[PDB]
Amino acid sequence: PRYLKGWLKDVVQLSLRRPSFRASRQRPIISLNERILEFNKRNITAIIAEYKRKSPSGLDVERDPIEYSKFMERYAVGLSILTEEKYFNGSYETLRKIASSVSIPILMKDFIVKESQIDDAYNLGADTVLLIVKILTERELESLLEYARSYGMEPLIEINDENDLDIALRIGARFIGINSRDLETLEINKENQRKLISMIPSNVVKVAESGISERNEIEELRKLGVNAFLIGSSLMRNPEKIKEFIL
């Protein structure tokens, strides 16, 4: 990885020592980005529901994974499951169980720094994976992307600034997530996010991440060309809220 400070440095060390998951994939790869594109064509708001009982920017919310999943399977274009243990209280089992209960695409949200973590996602049932530009080097980012593509997955490559955007385009990314929240400081900056969104070529599928609480934010981001929206916190407290962003 790159040189990191604070929690990002710690979570990365945990991830390097994260034990591999040994079992075989049951389900098929259900492409998330392609499903986002089809929803776009059918003019259905594409929302990615995130399941996380804990995070650095929030209070803990206990909720049953399977129930959340089965309910979202009716509304969301896909699911984003946190599997990072320490700061997000996620686990592999929770993903394994959910992947078996639903048939919509699943994104494994974790701090992927080695290839075995992509093997895990594959074996656990995830259809795709999140790659974070700021913790990885250009070389690493390129290999992991290629390694995920060999599995038939198109990773969601998360950016946060122009530096990140440059690299993302350079390594040939086609599925990018613009995070409004700076992972390091946990600060949200929507102006910077709208700036980046307009610098991304029309052909790449754009997912807006973080800071969405109202349906009109979605409509505005949408006129800017954003394809999908990843919403977590608000949905964990009141799942039903999805019916409101979705109309």
Indicate which residues carry an active-site annotation: 50, 52, 109, 158, 179, 209-210
Q: Where are the alpha helices (DSSP H) in the chain?
A: 6-16, 32-41, 65-72, 92-101, 116-124, 138-149, 162-170, 190-197, 215-223, 233-237, 242-245
Q: If you search the block for the tokens 């929240």, which residue do you land on?
A: 181
Both tokens assigned to 39 = 């929803």
Q: Report the amino acid identity of residue 39.
A: F
Sign of CA dihedral 152, 140, 179, 170: negative
The answer to whether residues 99 and 24 touch, using CB atoms and an 8 Å cutoff, is no
List beta partners, residue 79: 49, 106
Both tokens assigned to 64 = 């049953």
Q: End-to-end alpha-carbon separation of the chain, Å?
A: 41
